[PDB]
Amino acid sequence: MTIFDNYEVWFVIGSQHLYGPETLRQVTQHAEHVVNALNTEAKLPCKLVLKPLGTTPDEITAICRDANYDDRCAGLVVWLHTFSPAKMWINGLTMLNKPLLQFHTQFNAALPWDSIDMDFMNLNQTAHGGREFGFIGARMRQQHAVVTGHWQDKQAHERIGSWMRQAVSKQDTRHLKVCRFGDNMREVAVTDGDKVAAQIKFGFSVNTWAVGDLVQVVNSISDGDVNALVDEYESCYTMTPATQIHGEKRQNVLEAARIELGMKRFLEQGGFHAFTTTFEDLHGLKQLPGLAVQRLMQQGYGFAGEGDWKTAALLRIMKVMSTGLQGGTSFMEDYTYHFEKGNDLVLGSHMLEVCPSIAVEEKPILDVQHLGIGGKDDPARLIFNTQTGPAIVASLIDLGDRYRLLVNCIDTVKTPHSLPKLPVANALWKAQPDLPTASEAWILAGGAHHTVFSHALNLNDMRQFAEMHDIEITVIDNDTRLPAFKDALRWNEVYYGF
Amino acid sequence: MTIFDNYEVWFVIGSQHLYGPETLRQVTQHAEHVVNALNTEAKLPCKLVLKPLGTTPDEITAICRDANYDDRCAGLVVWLHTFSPAKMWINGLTMLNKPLLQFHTQFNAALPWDSIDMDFMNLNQTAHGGREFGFIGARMRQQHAVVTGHWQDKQAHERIGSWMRQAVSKQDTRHLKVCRFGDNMREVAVTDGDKVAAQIKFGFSVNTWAVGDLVQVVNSISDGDVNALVDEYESCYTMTPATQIHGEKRQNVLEAARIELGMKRFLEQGGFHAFTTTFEDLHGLKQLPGLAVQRLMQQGYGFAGEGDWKTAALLRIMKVMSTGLQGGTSFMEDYTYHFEKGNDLVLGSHMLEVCPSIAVEEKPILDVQHLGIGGKDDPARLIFNTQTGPAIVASLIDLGDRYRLLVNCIDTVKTPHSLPKLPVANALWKAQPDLPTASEAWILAGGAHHTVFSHALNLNDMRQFAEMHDIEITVIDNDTRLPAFKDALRWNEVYYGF
Amino acid sequence: MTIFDNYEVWFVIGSQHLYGPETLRQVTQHAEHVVNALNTEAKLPCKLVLKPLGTTPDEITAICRDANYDDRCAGLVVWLHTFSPAKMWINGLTMLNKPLLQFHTQFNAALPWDSIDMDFMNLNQTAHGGREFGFIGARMRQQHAVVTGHWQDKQAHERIGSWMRQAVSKQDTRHLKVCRFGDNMREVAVTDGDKVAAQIKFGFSVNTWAVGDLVQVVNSISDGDVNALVDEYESCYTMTPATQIHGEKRQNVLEAARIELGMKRFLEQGGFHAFTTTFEDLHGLKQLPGLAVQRLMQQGYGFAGEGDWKTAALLRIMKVMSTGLQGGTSFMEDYTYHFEKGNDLVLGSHMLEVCPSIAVEEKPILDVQHLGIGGKDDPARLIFNTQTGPAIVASLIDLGDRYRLLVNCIDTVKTPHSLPKLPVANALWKAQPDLPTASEAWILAGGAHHTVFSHALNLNDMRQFAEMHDIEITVIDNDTRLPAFKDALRWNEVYYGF
Numbered sequence A, B, C: 001m002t003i004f005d006n007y008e009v010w011f012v013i014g015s016q017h018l019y020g021p022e023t024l025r026q027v028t029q030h031a032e033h034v035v036n037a038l039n040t041e042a043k044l045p046c047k048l049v050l051k052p053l054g055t056t057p058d059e060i061t062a063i064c065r066d067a068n069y070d071d072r073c074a075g076l077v078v079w080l081h082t083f084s085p086a087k088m089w090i091n092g093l094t095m096l097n098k099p100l101l102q103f104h105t106q107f108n109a110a111l112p113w114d115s116i117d118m119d120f121m122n123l124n125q126t127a128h129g130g131r132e133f134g135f136i137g138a139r140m141r142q143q144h145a146v147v148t149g150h151w152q153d154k155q156a157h158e159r160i161g162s163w164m165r166q167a168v169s170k171q172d173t174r175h176l177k178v179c180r181f182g183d184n185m186r187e188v189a190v191t192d193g194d195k196v197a198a199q200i201k202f203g204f205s206v207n208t209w210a211v212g213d214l215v216q217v218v219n220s221i222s223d224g225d226v227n228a229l230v231d232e233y234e235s236c237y238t239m240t241p242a243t244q245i246h247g248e249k250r251q252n253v254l255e256a257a258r259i260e261l262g263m264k265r266f267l268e269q270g271g272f273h274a275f276t277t278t279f280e281d282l283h284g285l286k287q288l289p290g291l292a293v294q295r296l297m298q299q300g301y302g303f304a305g306e307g308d309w310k311t312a313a314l315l316r317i318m319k320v321m322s323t324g325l326q327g328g329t330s331f332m333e334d335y336t337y338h339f340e341k342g343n344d345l346v347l348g349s350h351m352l353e354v355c356p357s358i359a360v361e362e363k364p365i366l367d368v369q370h371l372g373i374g375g376k377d378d379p380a381r382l383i384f385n386t387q388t389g390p391a392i393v394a395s396l397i398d399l400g401d402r403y404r405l406l407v408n409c410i411d412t413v414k415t416p417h418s419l420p421k422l423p424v425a426n427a428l429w430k431a432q433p434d435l436p437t438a439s440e441a442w443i444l445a446g447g448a449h450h451t452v453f454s455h456a457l458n459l460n461d462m463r464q465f466a467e468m469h470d471i472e473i474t475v476i477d478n479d480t481r482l483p484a485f486k487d488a489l490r491w492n493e494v495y496y497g498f
């Protein structure tokens, strides 16, 4: 059971009652056959539910009405099997608050040249029926996705499935709750913003609980539960000598477990899906949460450092978005560079909190070392290298009047040498198209230092994400050239500045 | 003594070389005479400094250059004694970061009918010289204030002085720092916003320090200093029996003094000018700051409850703005109503924090009692009635893309019966034009529940404030009618929403 | 020697206090090392001055305050060595009137894989520090240039230096003064415009002096000075028989020298940097200034014919811009075409005034002949061919509501046959991508017939010029295709037409 089992997409057939109380039977039989075949074979993210034929205005209005009400309904995929006059859809589409995709398909794939007749033409007419429907969407300026192809086409399945994924993500995000432990790092701009605007736009909520509230729960955790979690550490991780029994930093490990159990309890009891910390407010805590945050991230929680709620929310969103796909997704920060002709690399990390979902090593190292920042005890953390392959780094920024999604396509590479003195985990990558252009484009477009790294999700996923939420996507990849990149920033500014 | 002594306004004379240098000698003489007479007699908020004549482009550019550099320079008041071709001012006005007012005046009041000749016409030509200058301001869309009248006109003095007041306020606000003790009350919208946008727009800064940081300073205060402050309470205030030496709530008074001294020390050492608290985060504190906050407000600090930084900043701004005026400016909240035909009243207060600067009684009551909200010890507070007369309540709200200043003209009235069971101070007023229309207009325009109350400042002061900062002012007063009020909201929306 | 020695660029280091003051000691050491190495080796247009570290809000505000005041300060190049919270920069950046470039660099080139630790990570973090700064620029919509690369990278030096060039040009242009001798040619549109708008936008001034004023100065010049200048003509130029001592046009040469000396004196005494003439107003002059204008242009003065102040100003700007580059920038006009398959050429000239800075021959011809236009004596001029190689032609036009910079990349070629009957100098070129498309794109975009020709400057220089001044650049080159060219015109129209 995943989150995707809590949702469904409605397969709605468009037609007319003009028509034949057979002829509609025939269309219904096609729809049932198609929907069943897709549910069984297509391997889509969630289940398609065939609804009664939309043949009259009140029927179509009813379906849209029901669609809005049903919390499991993540969207509609519409097949206009016959001509289905678009005025019939207006009242329904006007009220519809769930996303919609037209599957511009057909029954048959080969054209029956020798048998095709008016009867066939009067029943199988998606060719024009789908265009009349396309008009009303474009006329109303509604965000209607469209996928053309035969219903057995596996390329079409992929694209439909990809859209269904975004549909689910949009619903989930409307219930996403962020818990902040303290405010933003002082004097920082990018991590700030308008929480009210975010909730209006995306539907996720951001509210702060005092660090003291958390401390109370952490201090209530039993010694038995703390010891039990430490046993799970030793089975999961490669424990350094200082971390072992009789180690000089053994107590720092127990306390790390205490913080993890307290945070987890607090999060679960509050029904939270993501959270933030701030090293400038850790009163009552023995150490900056490190290990705790990493395992919580791995368990699916969203997170970002120094009160960065936008990225924390984004992490959760993308983690949920990537369900059932191969690869990890993590909080990330651009730490330092390697300048070398033809091999410019970016080293990515954070103070402590890097998610092991992107780790290569079956067993990360668990270590305790000094962290000056925050002025607390030596915190426990997981140290590891990042897996190799294509990835993206994404940043959602608040431009004051609107949001911008920056997405840089990257390629993670293996470290050319060990990092024996680096007490934190690392990601290492080549930024497309190259480091100077990638960094400059990002800086020109105002992208944050905090990002969401992912192997699981790609540029196409984020394009659809940005469309779904009607925000600017700023793309930085192999095709990026600065002059054209700047033109687009300007032309988008006047478009989205409406 | 005051902050106004830390600023000056530059009196700049506009002219040219067409008829000089004995004509220019005459202009300089007029300027010195005028400026001296104004500084001595006019009673303006701060000092006027006469600068060298602006007669060439490089001279005028130099003056503007110097004006930007001098931190004491709050603005320019320009007298165009002769014709002063406006292109000479362009390069200077383009770089100028300080506000500007044209004093459209004349040396002589009466026109010398029997002696007037070309020499006089060449020397005293503000009539047209001031209009050529007006064009360049309007052409560049710069916010140029203008006041017309003879330089000895006391009505003109008032208006010039009123502008100088706003000039000073604008500079001061650029160094205004807000210290938040904890975040916003959870789930609240109007008190939230974009701190980055605020600092870009107004120049004031808002950053959060952990309640724990404050607690450390409060816990460090000497017992001797605590006792000394309690002695000043007894001399200043009417102490209730429970508050006296052998009182059952005597210890709650000492702790209130402890919190005040700790907050004051923290504020002073950080160079802060305003602050906020939140009852949802009081870990380490014995009680919600009440008495402390009230005396700090009286001493000139800005404040608002539940992390409301906009109103806290606004309070400080308006407190500083009202320097030398017959006083009384306070944090305020609309608590409850009195519905009665011909006598609809609004009772204003806050859980604890009402500023005694607006008090009528020379000696407020200093009581201690139960406050459930926050779940802390019974906090000390000052109880008092509010003075009678014309006042305003002001609210600055963040509309997401821009700011709106709401200002409701009111009239405070004496309570028709005492409030013996109300453990907090009170303000009681009639809202112009009437309660239903005043409340509705406010609600329609999204005004906060938190406001800044003032006897000292009026609608005209706030109009100039809103002009100075280029924000919408939404006026609610005796002349307010809802249809026209709504029209203005719409027409301003498209204007300020460029 | 040069104007670039009258300016400097401030190298400002961004940091904070989170880990200091030995970390800050290290940053200061890097900055001093870097700045010294750049000043000595990098060969930048002007000197870099290292300023004290920007670590607090008031420090950064102070630097920006000082930057605006210092007339030698042409701009800031900012290196965010460590994380430097962007709200600290807001108050400073809001007041800043000088251009800014982020040098997104790093002290080390190679990443020390075997030694890298938290200390190194805390000290060398431009990777993220530069992105938090990028946000605030993008958020405020300020024109912040960005260059990424290692500080010893010579490609990065070039780009930084190229930006510094534009920085200097922007300051210089704010003091640029144009002297017009008479008004525009009657009935002409493109050479007209709004001088007030130009001065507001670019800072250069345009004012008209009567031809009579000039005539008075030309008539005052000594016979001795006239003869001395004629001696320098004979040493500099190849004198045609008619131009020699007993030549029939010898007296026309003396008068040409008289006009040159008078114009030069008038220009120098007025502090002018560019000028215009009009053949429709030459009362009191013996001939249309030709030779005089050509040598004045060579000596660095801006010029354009028939009262064309925009191009005259542009010539000066680009001449100053090209200081220290392999030279040749001139006033130019498209005179006639050569239509031939695979060899379409444009012949460029003007009635008299072509700058010998672009000449190939070390000694131009100095002839005298008949010019009907203007109806004056036969004027002296320099005749020469133009050098071979890549060039640009640039035109700044006033669209009424805004400015457009047209830039056509060209390639000058050697004349395939001599021009024995052409009494003026010539430039001959191939217009990219071809003549029909180049001419059509230019005409569609409203480009003037008057242009500034340059070998010294290229498309990249002008792109940065247009960014610096926030105007549309319309590019016509090998990559130009009309459909896409038209799309860009439309999309830019709505952007720049806010």
Ligand SMILES: OC[C@@H](O)[C@@H](O)[C@@H](O)CO
Binding pocket: B016, B018, B083, B125, B128
């Ligand atoms: O320069 C002064 C000017 O010439 C006279 O005041 C004019 O009358 C103004 O139009």
Ligand SMILES: OC[C@@H](O)[C@@H](O)[C@@H](O)CO
Binding pocket: B185, B305, B306, B333, B350, B351, B449
């Ligand atoms: O939760 C209630 C709220 O905290 C109080 O009513 C405040 O006085 C509102 O500002």
Ligand SMILES: OC[C@@H](O)[C@@H](O)[C@@H](O)CO
Binding pocket: A185, A305, A306, A333, A350, A351, A449, C016, C018, C083, C125, C128
């Ligand atoms: O103030 C420094 C800051 O705390 C660190 O560099 C963070 O990692 C930036 O997000």
Ligand SMILES: OC[C@@H](O)[C@@H](O)[C@@H](O)CO
Binding pocket: C185, C305, C306, C333, C350, C351, C449
């Ligand atoms: O009247 C014609 C015109 O004056 C000449 O052709 C110029 O060379 C055009 O710039």
Ligand SMILES: [Mn+2]
Binding pocket: A305, A306, A333, A350, A450
């Ligand atoms: Mn971080």
Ligand SMILES: [Mn+2]
Binding pocket: B305, B306, B333, B350, B450
């Ligand atoms: Mn309140």
Ligand SMILES: [Mn+2]
Binding pocket: C305, C306, C333, C350, C450
């Ligand atoms: Mn011409």
